Write a protein that holds these residues in place. Structure first.
Motif, PDB file in Angstrom:
ATOM      1  N   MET A  79      69.963   0.383  30.986  1.00 42.45           N
ATOM      2  CA  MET A  79      69.144  -0.597  30.333  1.00 42.45           C
ATOM      3  C   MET A  79      69.686  -1.884  29.377  1.00 42.45           C
ATOM      4  SD  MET A  79      66.410   0.726  26.802  1.00 42.45           S
ATOM      5  CE  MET A  79      65.526   1.482  28.689  1.00 42.45           C
ATOM      6  N   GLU A  80      68.671  -2.377  30.004  1.00 43.55           N
ATOM      7  CA  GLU A  80      69.814  -3.977  28.793  1.00 43.55           C
ATOM      8  C   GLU A  80      69.637  -4.388  27.352  1.00 43.55           C
ATOM      9  OE1 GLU A  80      66.200  -3.572  29.953  1.00 43.55           O
ATOM     10  OE2 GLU A  80      64.712  -4.990  29.148  1.00 43.55           O
ATOM     11  N   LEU A  81      70.146  -5.062  26.627  1.00 41.10           N
ATOM     12  CA  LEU A  81      70.223  -5.183  25.439  1.00 41.10           C
ATOM     13  C   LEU A  81      68.866  -5.657  24.620  1.00 41.10           C
ATOM     14  CD1 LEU A  81      73.719  -6.308  25.893  1.00 41.10           C
ATOM     15  CD2 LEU A  81      73.448  -3.865  25.174  1.00 41.10           C
TER      16      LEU A  81
ATOM     17  N   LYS B  61      52.570   0.086  30.264  1.00 37.48           N
ATOM     18  CA  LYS B  61      51.621  -0.714  31.473  1.00 37.48           C
ATOM     19  C   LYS B  61      52.242  -1.940  31.609  1.00 37.48           C
ATOM     20  CE  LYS B  61      47.925  -3.509  30.239  1.00 37.48           C
ATOM     21  NZ  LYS B  61      46.887  -3.653  29.433  1.00 37.48           N
ATOM     22  N   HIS B  62      52.838  -2.695  30.059  1.00 42.69           N
ATOM     23  CA  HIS B  62      53.426  -3.978  30.489  1.00 42.69           C
ATOM     24  C   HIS B  62      55.254  -3.189  30.503  1.00 42.69           C
ATOM     25  CE1 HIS B  62      49.957  -6.150  28.929  1.00 42.69           C
ATOM     26  NE2 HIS B  62      50.187  -4.844  28.251  1.00 42.69           N
ATOM     27  N   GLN B  63      55.489  -3.665  31.882  1.00 42.80           N
ATOM     28  CA  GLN B  63      56.673  -3.239  32.220  1.00 42.80           C
ATOM     29  C   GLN B  63      58.039  -4.384  31.726  1.00 42.80           C
ATOM     30  OE1 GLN B  63      56.337  -0.680  35.810  1.00 42.80           O
ATOM     31  NE2 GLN B  63      54.678  -1.083  33.600  1.00 42.80           N
ATOM     32  N   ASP B  64      57.839  -5.176  30.808  1.00 44.45           N
ATOM     33  CA  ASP B  64      59.085  -6.003  30.490  1.00 44.45           C
ATOM     34  C   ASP B  64      58.877  -5.512  29.372  1.00 44.45           C
ATOM     35  OD1 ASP B  64      56.200  -7.073  29.641  1.00 44.45           O
ATOM     36  OD2 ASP B  64      57.806  -9.002  28.787  1.00 44.45           O
ATOM     37  N   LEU B  65      57.782  -4.526  28.419  1.00 44.80           N
ATOM     38  CA  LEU B  65      58.371  -4.578  26.890  1.00 44.80           C
ATOM     39  C   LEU B  65      58.987  -2.660  26.425  1.00 44.80           C
ATOM     40  CD1 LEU B  65      54.610  -5.776  25.531  1.00 44.80           C
ATOM     41  CD2 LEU B  65      57.388  -6.750  25.573  1.00 44.80           C
TER      42      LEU B  65
ATOM     43  N   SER C  90      46.718  -1.544  24.553  1.00 50.30           N
ATOM     44  CA  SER C  90      47.412  -1.748  25.845  1.00 50.30           C
ATOM     45  C   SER C  90      47.125  -3.367  25.965  1.00 50.30           C
ATOM     46  CB  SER C  90      45.931  -0.980  26.498  1.00 50.30           C
ATOM     47  OG  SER C  90      45.395  -1.841  27.784  1.00 50.30           O
ATOM     48  N   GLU C  91      45.856  -3.621  24.055  1.00 49.92           N
ATOM     49  CA  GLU C  91      45.620  -5.100  24.599  1.00 49.92           C
ATOM     50  C   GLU C  91      46.256  -6.183  22.988  1.00 49.92           C
ATOM     51  OE1 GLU C  91      45.357  -7.555  27.289  1.00 49.92           O
ATOM     52  OE2 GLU C  91      45.493  -5.200  28.741  1.00 49.92           O
ATOM     53  N   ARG C  92      45.811  -5.437  22.118  1.00 50.94           N
ATOM     54  CA  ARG C  92      45.839  -6.130  21.104  1.00 50.94           C
ATOM     55  C   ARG C  92      47.714  -6.313  20.755  1.00 50.94           C
ATOM     56  NH1 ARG C  92      41.452  -4.710  17.606  1.00 50.94           N
ATOM     57  NH2 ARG C  92      42.325  -3.085  18.747  1.00 50.94           N
ATOM     58  N   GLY C  93      48.509  -4.623  20.643  1.00 58.92           N
ATOM     59  CA  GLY C  93      49.786  -4.438  20.576  1.00 58.92           C
ATOM     60  C   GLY C  93      50.390  -5.012  20.888  1.00 58.92           C
ATOM     61  N   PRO C  94      50.072  -5.231  22.073  1.00 57.99           N
ATOM     62  CA  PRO C  94      51.636  -6.067  23.697  1.00 57.99           C
ATOM     63  C   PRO C  94      51.106  -7.184  22.847  1.00 57.99           C
ATOM     64  CG  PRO C  94      50.396  -3.764  25.040  1.00 57.99           C
ATOM     65  CD  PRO C  94      49.527  -3.741  23.463  1.00 57.99           C
ATOM     66  N   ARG C  95      49.706  -7.888  22.874  1.00 58.83           N
ATOM     67  CA  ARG C  95      50.377  -9.596  23.036  1.00 58.83           C
ATOM     68  C   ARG C  95      50.360  -9.887  21.044  1.00 58.83           C
ATOM     69  NH1 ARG C  95      44.171  -9.864  23.344  1.00 58.83           N
ATOM     70  NH2 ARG C  95      44.330 -10.163  21.322  1.00 58.83           N
ATOM     71  N   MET C  96      50.467  -9.248  20.241  1.00 56.62           N
ATOM     72  CA  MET C  96      51.034  -9.741  19.259  1.00 56.62           C
ATOM     73  C   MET C  96      52.900  -9.477  19.562  1.00 56.62           C
ATOM     74  SD  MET C  96      50.433 -10.849  15.760  1.00 56.62           S
ATOM     75  CE  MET C  96      48.918 -10.115  15.629  1.00 56.62           C
ATOM     76  N   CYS C  97      53.737  -8.610  20.290  1.00 58.10           N
ATOM     77  CA  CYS C  97      54.768  -8.728  19.967  1.00 58.10           C
ATOM     78  C   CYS C  97      55.120  -9.613  20.971  1.00 58.10           C
ATOM     79  CB  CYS C  97      54.824  -6.841  20.888  1.00 58.10           C
ATOM     80  SG  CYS C  97      56.529  -6.502  21.827  1.00 58.10           S
ATOM     81  N   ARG C  98      54.288  -9.688  22.040  1.00 59.53           N
ATOM     82  CA  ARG C  98      54.778 -11.047  23.012  1.00 59.53           C
ATOM     83  C   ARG C  98      54.748 -11.915  21.972  1.00 59.53           C
ATOM     84  NH1 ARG C  98      52.176  -9.300  26.853  1.00 59.53           N
ATOM     85  NH2 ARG C  98      53.369  -8.287  28.099  1.00 59.53           N
ATOM     86  N   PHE C  99      54.017 -12.348  21.523  1.00 58.25           N
ATOM     87  CA  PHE C  99      53.931 -13.713  19.811  1.00 58.25           C
ATOM     88  C   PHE C  99      54.510 -13.556  19.263  1.00 58.25           C
ATOM     89  CE2 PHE C  99      51.769 -14.831  15.544  1.00 58.25           C
ATOM     90  CZ  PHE C  99      51.954 -16.338  16.070  1.00 58.25           C
ATOM     91  N   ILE C 100      55.197 -12.551  19.043  1.00 61.16           N
ATOM     92  CA  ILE C 100      56.112 -12.724  17.529  1.00 61.16           C
ATOM     93  C   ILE C 100      57.598 -13.146  18.162  1.00 61.16           C
ATOM     94  CG2 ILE C 100      57.549 -11.050  16.062  1.00 61.16           C
ATOM     95  CD1 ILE C 100      55.142 -12.371  14.388  1.00 61.16           C
ATOM     96  N   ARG C 101      57.435 -12.170  19.432  1.00 59.64           N
ATOM     97  CA  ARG C 101      59.129 -12.798  20.167  1.00 59.64           C
ATOM     98  C   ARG C 101      59.129 -14.204  20.009  1.00 59.64           C
ATOM     99  NH1 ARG C 101      63.283  -9.665  22.008  1.00 59.64           N
ATOM    100  NH2 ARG C 101      62.261  -8.859  19.569  1.00 59.64           N
TER     101      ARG C 101
ATOM    102  N   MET D 181      62.078  -4.486  19.301  1.00 60.46           N
ATOM    103  CA  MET D 181      60.183  -4.320  19.188  1.00 60.46           C
ATOM    104  C   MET D 181      59.657  -2.994  20.264  1.00 60.46           C
ATOM    105  SD  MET D 181      59.587  -7.686  17.777  1.00 60.46           S
ATOM    106  CE  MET D 181      59.525  -9.195  19.678  1.00 60.46           C
ATOM    107  N   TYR D 182      58.814  -2.298  19.885  1.00 58.44           N
ATOM    108  CA  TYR D 182      58.139  -1.363  20.655  1.00 58.44           C
ATOM    109  C   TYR D 182      56.462  -1.671  20.360  1.00 58.44           C
ATOM    110  CZ  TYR D 182      63.280   0.635  20.514  1.00 58.44           C
ATOM    111  OH  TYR D 182      64.343   0.772  20.429  1.00 58.44           O
ATOM    112  N   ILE D 183      56.250  -0.515  21.963  1.00 57.81           N
ATOM    113  CA  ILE D 183      55.263  -0.832  21.767  1.00 57.81           C
ATOM    114  C   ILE D 183      54.845   1.067  21.490  1.00 57.81           C
ATOM    115  CG2 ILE D 183      52.933  -0.705  22.570  1.00 57.81           C
ATOM    116  CD1 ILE D 183      53.923  -3.430  21.737  1.00 57.81           C
TER     117      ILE D 183
END
Ligand code: CL
Length: 171
Positions: free
Chosen positions: A1-3, A19-23, A98-109, A126-128
């Protein structure tokens, strides 16, 4: 697994499929492991970011979680004066994660990358929370307060939902 994001070390927590394969997703049990200090010798601080609307949060949330549904407030709380440490970890979730959490995670990154010289980050790990509050509450009610669950689509909060959405940056 990646760092983790700044490529400094491996992700600390065991993950589950999401659902979001990269998170990276964690289970309610892993969230409780953090809350009970199973990783206290390694994790200096972690923040549970509840991305649901205020009425949902008020109807029952995970103990110590911070309600930051609006991107501008999440950015201000986390990046105006970064939480420094050991590791710092962020866990994002919403009702179903499914939507709001993953979206915020991506936004912060996105914002974290923007204010840093690559590949450094204030929040490299960061995790979901898999299944969101909907799946956490039935597993660990005593780690929630109040001990209840108010869905986003609750019949008595239709106006509250509209009121909140008109404060978001985009729809
Ligand atoms: Cl927003």
């Amino acid at each position: 697994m990646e760092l983790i994001g700044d490529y400094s070390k491996a992700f600390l927590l065991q993950t589950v499929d999401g659902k979001h394969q990269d998170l990276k997703y964690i289970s309610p049990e892993t969230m409780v492991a953090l809350l009970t200090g199973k990783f206290s010798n390694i994790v200096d601080k972690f923040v549970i970011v509840d991305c649901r609307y205020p009425y949902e949060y008020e109807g029952g949330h995970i103990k110590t979680a911070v309600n930051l549904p609006l991107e501008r407030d999440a950015e201000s709380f986390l990046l105006k004066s970064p939480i420094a440490p050991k590791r710092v970890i962020l866990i994002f979730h919403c009702e179903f994660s499914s939507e709001r959490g993953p979206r915020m995670c991506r936004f912060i990154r996105e914002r974290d990358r923007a204010v840093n010289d690559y590949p450094s980050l204030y929040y490299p790990e960061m995790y979901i929370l898999k299944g969101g509050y909907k799946e956490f509450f039935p597993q660990h009610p005593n780690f929630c307060e109040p001990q209840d669950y108010r869905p986003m689509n609750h019949e008595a909060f239709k106006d509250e939902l509209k009121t909140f959405r008109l404060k978001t940056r985009s729809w």
